């Protein structure tokens, strides 16, 4: 589609350049080409669109494109900062033993050093957003 995400790999975390439109673009390129094929197959074979294996493998790939897009949006909305880049959430970093070398390490190298933190962090980020929402709920009610 473009693969501009991978294009900056090796540039280090600082000044890596983050792009928020990148998932929309990979999905959009995908949907258009797959839709054209959905309408093209019936020109010769309309009956066996899902009966045989190719139509169930292609269904899983079309479903994955949609489910993947939505998982990112759902996780971001759970955190609430879907369009905030750095998001600036209130959950503290777990420990001082895992601090990135912002000017030496690449995001690819860094993320693999925090895989065991993400499991606890995702929940904490959601909890922080939930309490902020509870506080606003009460302000709107009263």
């Amino acid at each position: 589609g473009f693969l501009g995400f991978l294009a900056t790999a090796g540039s280090a975390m600082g000044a890596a350049s983050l792009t928020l439109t990148a998932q929309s673009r990979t999905l959009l390129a995908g949907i258009v080409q797959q839709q054209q094929q959905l309408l093209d197959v019936p020109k010769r074979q309309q009956e066996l669109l899902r009966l045989t294996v190719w139509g169930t493998k292609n269904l899983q790939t079309r479903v994955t494109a949609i489910e993947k897009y939505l998982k990112d949006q759902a996780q971001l909305n759970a955190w609430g900062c879907a369009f905030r880049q750095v998001c600036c959430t209130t959950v503290p970093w777990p420990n001082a033993s895992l601090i990135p070398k912002w000017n030496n390490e690449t995001w690819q190298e860094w993320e693999r050093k925090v895989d065991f933190l993400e499991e606890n962090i995702t929940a904490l980020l959601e909890e922080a957003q939930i309490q902020q929402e509870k506080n606003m709920y009460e302000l709107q009610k009263l």
């Binding site: 693969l3 995400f5 991978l6 294009a7 790999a9 090796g10 540039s11 975390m13 890596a16 350049s17 983050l18 792009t19 928020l20 998932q23 990979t26 999905l27 390129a29 995908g30 080409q33 797959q34 054209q36 197959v41 010769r44 066996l48 294996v53 190719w54 493998k57 292609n58 899983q60 790939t61 994955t64 494109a65 993947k68 897009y69 990112d72 971001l76 900062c81 905030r84 750095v86 998001c87 600036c88 959430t89 209130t90 959950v91 503290p92 970093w93 777990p94 895992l98 601090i99 990135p100 912002w102 690449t106 690819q108 860094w110 993320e111 925090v114 933190l117 993400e118 962090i121 980020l125």
Partner: protein, 493 residues
């Protein structure tokens, strides 16, 4: 002070294990039904990253193997079953005895001849022995004219038909036939049911490439030091789709490969001694196979209304045979040198102690070269070729195999045990007319197996599936996961 925060739009990825899309140019049948059109975009970007690549344990190669097999199965599934043909056929006895399917003791043959008879015979494009299909040493195709009684759609009416079988396809009952008309059955019927591969399979080329779904990408190792297994590839290239793959099946040598470069590469399994040796395109290695004669094809309608294609040749043509052109002697010397210098080889550095060899055993599946010429499978006996390309001192290989030639005798087999791990037998319809195929030779499929610093044996292999691991192999499929976490001071309000 330092908060987790969320970084969206991050340039990072992990291993993916998902199905890929196929895209093609040939959309006459299969392509329209299953594939997207080939966009034609073969560009790639280089990345400043290090990544681990493997060919024998990938998702890209393991889909190519399973997808080619699966598209075959869905093509033959609706074709005529030949269980109605598993009846005794009345076959000419002379031809059953001459080709050895049945026995006779009334032939009492005795031959006196010169034993110092080994010859060297070379052929090339500018030769009448090719045009006339009569190179020194070629014999007749081995065909048994057989008759049988078959019933069509009218049920209470039947006709006798003329079918000529290759000997390779018959069983033939033996014992106490003191007359004529031997009693034969198809070679693979009784343990199973033979289905005809009716939808033009193998009559044309199947080529396609794989494309990653949205959010996924293919990384490729673009080194020259890539040997199939490489834990740290410094030249990683990223793209959305693979190179175009040729889904060709054969044993011993691979033909028409896409990875045809002016270099010899040898991929080795990381945990094994099995390799695929590409050949240097510099030498224009080519195999030209011929099916002499002019076939007649006669459709037969069988009971259910589906049609079987019979072969009433009623003639005696010469053997199918193959001619090897290009600088084979030099291409093989490079293979030996490439093995000697290879990182995983700790054998002999004497190239005269490294030899090509057939796999052993009496099993035709490994001892003959199996190749596809527009729908008919040919099984070639390659002793003449190997003796020639290695400039081997034959001397004691039994008179017939003691020749050095750049061509080999071969035979046609119509009932084929297919290449995947199935045990399924299908019938390949004959092609009408004459056949010729001119293919390039791009790889040598072999195991390298040595136990000492003298004798290395490059053993030709029948594992056709591994050929797909040279066509792809250098690809890795990854998932882009652009959400990162990292301590920073920038907390909201």
């Amino acid at each position: 002070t330092l908060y987790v925060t969320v970084f969206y739009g991050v340039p990072a990825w992990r291993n993916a294990t998902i199905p890929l899309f196929c895209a093609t140019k040939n959309r006459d049948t299969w392509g329209t039904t299953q594939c997207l059109p080939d966009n034609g975009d073969y560009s790639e970007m280089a990345l400043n990253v290090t990544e681990s690549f493997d060919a024998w344990n990938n998702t890209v190669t393991e889909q190519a193997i399973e997808d080619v097999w699966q598209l075959f199965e869905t093509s033959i599934k609706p074709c005529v079953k030949l269980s109605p043909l598993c009846i005794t056929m009345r076959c000419n006895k002379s031809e059953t005895d001459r080709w050895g399917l049945t026995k006779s003791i009334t032939t009492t043959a005795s031959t006196t001849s010169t034993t110092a008879s080994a010859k060297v015979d070379m052929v090339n494009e500018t030769s009448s022995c090719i045009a006339q299909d009569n190179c020194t040493g070629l014999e007749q195709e081995q065909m048994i004219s057989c008759k049988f009684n078959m019933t069509g759609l009218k049920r209470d009416k039947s006709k006798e038909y003329n079918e000529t079988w290759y000997s390779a396809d018959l069983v033939c009952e033996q014992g106490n036939n003191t007359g004529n008309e031997s009693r034969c059955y198809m070679n693979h019927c009784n343990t199973s049911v033979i289905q005809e591969s009716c939808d033009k399979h193998y009559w044309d080329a199947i080529r396609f490439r794989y494309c990653a779904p949205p959010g996924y990408a293919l990384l490729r190792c673009n080194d020259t030091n890539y040997s199939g297994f490489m834990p740290k590839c410094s030249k990683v290239v990223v793209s959305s789709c693979t190179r175009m793959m040729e889904t060709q099946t054969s044993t011993w040598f691979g033909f028409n490969g896409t990875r045809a470069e002016n270099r010899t590469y040898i991929y080795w399994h990381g945990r094994d001694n099995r390799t695929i040796i590409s050949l240097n395109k510099y030498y224009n290695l080519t195999m030209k196979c011929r099916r002499p004669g002019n076939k007649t094809v006669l459709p037969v309608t069988i009971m259910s209304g589906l049609v079987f294609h019979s072969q009433p040749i009623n003639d005696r043509p010469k053997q199918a045979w193959c001619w090897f052109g290009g600088k084979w002697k030099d291409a093989i010397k490079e293979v030996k040198q490439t093995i000697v210098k290879h990182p995983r080889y700790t054998g002999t550095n004497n190239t005269d102690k490294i030899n090509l060899t057939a796999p052993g055993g009496g099993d035709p599946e490994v001892t003959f070269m199996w190749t596809n010429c527009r729908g008919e499978f040919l099984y070639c006996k390659m002793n003449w070729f190997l003796n020639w390309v290695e400039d081997r001192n034959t001397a004691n290989q039994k008179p017939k195999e003691q020749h050095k030639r750049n061509y080999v005798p071969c035979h046609i087999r119509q009932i084929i045990n297919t290449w995947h791990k199935v045990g399924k037998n299908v019938y390949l319809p004959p092609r009408e007319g004459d056949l010729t195929c001119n293919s390039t030779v791009t790889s040598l499929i072999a195991n390298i197996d040595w136990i000492d610093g003298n004798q290395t044996n490059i053993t030709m292999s029948a594992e056709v599936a591994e050929l797909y691991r040279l066509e792809l192999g250098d690809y890795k499929l990854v998932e882009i996961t652009p959400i990162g976490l990292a301590p920073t001071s920038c907390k909201r309000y």
